[PDB]
Design an enzyme around this catalytic site. Structure first.
Site, PDB file in Angstrom:
ATOM      1  N   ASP A   1     -21.082  76.590   7.183  1.00 26.12           N
ATOM      2  CA  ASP A   1     -21.330  75.164   7.054  1.00 26.12           C
ATOM      3  C   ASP A   1     -22.446  74.790   6.082  1.00 26.12           C
ATOM      4  O   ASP A   1     -23.001  73.703   6.186  1.00 26.12           O
ATOM      5  CB  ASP A   1     -21.669  74.614   8.443  1.00 26.12           C
ATOM      6  CG  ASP A   1     -20.748  75.154   9.528  1.00 26.12           C
ATOM      7  OD1 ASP A   1     -21.199  75.289  10.687  1.00 26.12           O
ATOM      8  OD2 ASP A   1     -19.567  75.433   9.232  1.00 26.12           O
TER       9      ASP A   1
ATOM     10  N   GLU B   1     -13.521  80.793  10.299  1.00 21.85           N
ATOM     11  CA  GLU B   1     -14.321  80.409  11.462  1.00 21.85           C
ATOM     12  C   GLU B   1     -14.569  78.905  11.477  1.00 21.85           C
ATOM     13  O   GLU B   1     -15.679  78.451  11.740  1.00 21.85           O
ATOM     14  CB  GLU B   1     -15.664  81.150  11.492  1.00 21.85           C
ATOM     15  CG  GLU B   1     -16.251  81.224  12.911  1.00 21.85           C
ATOM     16  CD  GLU B   1     -17.682  81.737  12.966  1.00 21.85           C
ATOM     17  OE1 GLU B   1     -17.960  82.829  12.427  1.00 21.85           O
ATOM     18  OE2 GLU B   1     -18.533  81.049  13.568  1.00 21.85           O
TER      19      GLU B   1
ATOM     20  N   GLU C   1     -25.309  70.249   8.082  1.00 23.82           N
ATOM     21  CA  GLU C   1     -24.222  71.151   8.467  1.00 23.82           C
ATOM     22  C   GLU C   1     -22.969  70.542   9.083  1.00 23.82           C
ATOM     23  O   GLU C   1     -21.859  70.945   8.738  1.00 23.82           O
ATOM     24  CB  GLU C   1     -24.754  72.252   9.394  1.00 23.82           C
ATOM     25  CG  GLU C   1     -25.651  73.272   8.704  1.00 23.82           C
ATOM     26  CD  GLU C   1     -27.103  72.834   8.608  1.00 23.82           C
ATOM     27  OE1 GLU C   1     -27.913  73.609   8.056  1.00 23.82           O
ATOM     28  OE2 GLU C   1     -27.440  71.728   9.082  1.00 23.82           O
TER      29      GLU C   1
ATOM     30  N   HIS D   1     -36.020  92.492  23.870  1.00 25.15           N
ATOM     31  CA  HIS D   1     -36.820  91.741  22.902  1.00 25.15           C
ATOM     32  C   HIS D   1     -36.787  90.221  23.058  1.00 25.15           C
ATOM     33  O   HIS D   1     -37.292  89.509  22.190  1.00 25.15           O
ATOM     34  CB  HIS D   1     -36.408  92.080  21.466  1.00 25.15           C
ATOM     35  CG  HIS D   1     -35.031  91.610  21.108  1.00 25.15           C
ATOM     36  ND1 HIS D   1     -34.801  90.588  20.212  1.00 25.15           N
ATOM     37  CD2 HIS D   1     -33.812  92.019  21.530  1.00 25.15           C
ATOM     38  CE1 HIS D   1     -33.500  90.390  20.095  1.00 25.15           C
ATOM     39  NE2 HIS D   1     -32.877  91.247  20.884  1.00 25.15           N
TER      40      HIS D   1
ATOM     41  N   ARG E   1     -38.096  86.961  23.726  1.00 28.03           N
ATOM     42  CA  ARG E   1     -39.479  86.517  23.808  1.00 28.03           C
ATOM     43  C   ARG E   1     -39.941  86.079  25.193  1.00 28.03           C
ATOM     44  O   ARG E   1     -41.077  86.349  25.573  1.00 28.03           O
ATOM     45  CB  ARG E   1     -39.746  85.386  22.814  1.00 28.03           C
ATOM     46  CG  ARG E   1     -41.228  85.205  22.550  1.00 28.03           C
ATOM     47  CD  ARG E   1     -41.577  83.811  22.067  1.00 28.03           C
ATOM     48  NE  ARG E   1     -43.019  83.669  21.881  1.00 28.03           N
ATOM     49  CZ  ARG E   1     -43.924  83.934  22.820  1.00 28.03           C
ATOM     50  NH1 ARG E   1     -43.542  84.357  24.018  1.00 28.03           N
ATOM     51  NH2 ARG E   1     -45.216  83.782  22.560  1.00 28.03           N
TER      52      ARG E   1
ATOM     53  N   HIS F   1     -38.513  96.878  19.096  1.00 33.47           N
ATOM     54  CA  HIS F   1     -38.927  95.941  18.058  1.00 33.47           C
ATOM     55  C   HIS F   1     -40.378  96.187  17.638  1.00 33.47           C
ATOM     56  O   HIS F   1     -41.190  96.681  18.424  1.00 33.47           O
ATOM     57  CB  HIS F   1     -38.739  94.497  18.526  1.00 33.47           C
ATOM     58  CG  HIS F   1     -37.337  93.995  18.364  1.00 33.47           C
ATOM     59  ND1 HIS F   1     -36.292  94.444  19.143  1.00 33.47           N
ATOM     60  CD2 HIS F   1     -36.801  93.124  17.478  1.00 33.47           C
ATOM     61  CE1 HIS F   1     -35.171  93.872  18.740  1.00 33.47           C
ATOM     62  NE2 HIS F   1     -35.450  93.067  17.732  1.00 33.47           N
TER      63      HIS F   1
END
Lengths: 372, 373
Positions: free
Chosen positions: B97, B119, B133, B203, B205, B235
């Site tokens: 997009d 897609e 977008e 990972h 957060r 990470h």
């Protein structure tokens, strides 16, 4: 003061937008502005001058044909800068030109709401007309308010995902435009006394028949010596060479060169009947209440052929002579045509567009759809 | 082949989703796929396509500096039109997009070249969010000859915009094909002990402060399954390492690695009996490979996966995580059911369907059947 920028680049667009500009000027809190986006600045200013309108800004464009991708690329940046510098709070575009979409996209990218006049018309084929069908569809993806000239146009937009609250059926601003232009325009100079009969065989279709048609026009003019037939020829080699050698000697006929919008509107207004082969000039006749005789036998919107506005005289040389002559000898039937209800608009479409914009800008109430 | 199909894209994520299409097109007689890069990092994208054994054919000239949207579009449009014409494109495929994607699609349309949108169909229903977008994708779809919708819902959105049935093909996600391809072409990390393996990834957060507690739970799991090797690409974030290193370093059957490349990670997962993660993206990757996934969260960020039975929630309570993971590793039938579950995102052959859809438009084959969820 909210600023509404009308952006367009052709004379036909200018005439259709003039009524919108004039109505906006009459709304407190709003100020209409004109951004020219085409070639031929002098021609546009001349067209706008009929309505007493001058532009506020002009884009820089090439005077000849340019590849479409290059044209779009040239318009986009310019347009975005022009709209921001003009302080636009709303932008109105018209039609389906590449330039029109480019301006609408520039506005959208700058966060300026866009209204699209005469929107909703569809062919259902992206390959025809090319690239116009795509241009109008792309433009409508980005439009805040679509001004549909007809219920059908509204239906089309609704099938493309447009919300009903964002669609207003207004009728054609072209109706407002020709009605006003008929009053503003001035008749061609030197013309004899009336009544008048306007003739204009513009369509490039009847290239061969053009001669026969001219022969018929000569004979009808003889059948009506007390009527003056004004005919603006397109000074085209193929056309002139086919009509002049036939009508030049007719004292009853008056051959003129192409006329400007205002002058042609005034002439039609001052005429008892219009003989043509142009779809555009047939709709103007409808707005003016002037009977029209199409030199065809099919095709087009049966809206007018729905009795009233126009009548077909076929392509048959003898047939045309009889259809028209039969009409000029039947004025009282021509009276039934002049009183025909205009199915294209009530002449207040420009006012509805302006009110629609005022509504979007919080200055007034939402106008209601125009009903035929 | 005689017909030429240009795939135009400019970002690594786009390249990944298009690679499966490119390769599928190369396998169709009468067609030849070509790649037109449209982004800012030529060398970067060039290396991304390397994994799939793809080279670009042409590149647009794009500034590196940030630029106003109208100026960017103006910069892309002309050179894109010229590139597509000079490359002799008979069909153009775009994905995504972005403004560049629409500019390329419009360039193709203006040059009279049919455009396909991969897609396609996802909508927010708001032109202001995401901006620009949502507008970009709607504009692109006005011009598309064939829309390849990932889901029935996407198709429903397209129809709602005036797109006709014949112009839409439900393909599923090419992203699935991409993972399978990356796994096949990729290579596992070097020096790993003999398997079987369990891939671990933590990972998210928000789970940051729970990492030490969760690591301890995973340590308990590792101690309970001495014959399995737990591979964990940790990470780089110091916050993550300060939490996990002190707990998992020194654990005999845990292997801590640095972040892996797309292909190497896909290969590792494919070679694993189970994937333990708290990432939605990795959970979906596991599903593409038919690898059972246990999610270290109390709730899923997408009901499709849970509903399809491709993942199991373990929660974030340490005792619970241990119980769930240990229980699953000792339930071969449950692991098997997860590997056999129908992938709710695609069957791994979306690329072939897109390719066949194009061939059909070019009159080089019949219309493929839509993927069924």
């Amino acid at each position: 003061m909210k600023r509404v920028v009308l952006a367009f680049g052709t004379r036909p667009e200018a005439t259709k937008m003039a009524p919108v500009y004039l109505a906006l000027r009459g709304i407190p809190g709003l100020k209409p502005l004109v951004l020219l986006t085409g070639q031929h600045r002098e021609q546009l200013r001349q067209a706008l001058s009929l309505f007493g309108i001058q532009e506020d800004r002009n884009l820089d464009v090439m005077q000849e044909r340019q590849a479409l991708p290059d044209l779009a690329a040239r318009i986009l940046p310019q347009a975005a800068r022009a709209l921001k510098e003009m302080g636009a709070d709303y932008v109105l575009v018209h039609g389906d030109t590449l330039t029109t979409f480019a301006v609408a996209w520039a506005a959208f990218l700058e966060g300026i709401p866009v209204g699209h006049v005469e929107a909703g018309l569809r062919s259902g084929n992206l390959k025809e007309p090319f690239p116009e069908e795509a241009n109008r569809r792309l433009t409508d993806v980005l439009t805040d308010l679509d001004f549909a000239p007809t219920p059908l146009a509204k239906a089309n937009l609704l099938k493309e995902g447009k919300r009903e609250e964002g669609i207003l059926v207004t009728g054609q601003t072209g109706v407002d435009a020709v009605l006003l232009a008929a009053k503003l325009g001035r008749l061609p100079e030197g013309l004899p006394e009336g009544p008048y009969v306007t003739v204009t065989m513009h369509r490039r279709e009847n290239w061969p028949l053009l001669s026969d048609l001219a022969q018929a026009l000569k004979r009808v003019a003889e059948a009506f010596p007390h009527l003056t037939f004004v005919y603006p020829v397109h000074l085209n080699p193929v056309v002139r060479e086919a009509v002049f050698p036939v009508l030049k000697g007719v004292r009853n006929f008056v051959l003129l060169d192409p006329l400007e919008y205002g002058s042609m509107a005034a002439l039609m207004r001052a005429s008892l009947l219009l003989v043509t082969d142009s779809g555009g000039l047939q709709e103007e006749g409808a707005a003016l209440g002037v009977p029209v005789v199409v030199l065809r036998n099919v095709t087009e919107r049966p809206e007018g052929l729905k009795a009233g506005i126009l009548k077909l005289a076929g392509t048959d040389p003898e047939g045309v002579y009889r259809v028209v002559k039969g009409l000029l000898e039947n004025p009282e039937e021509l009276s039934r045509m002049r009183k025909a209800k205009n199915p294209y608009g009530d002449g207040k479409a420009g006012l509805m567009v302006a009110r629609g914009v005022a509504w979007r800008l919080g200055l007034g109430p939402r106008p209601e759809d125009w009903l035929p």
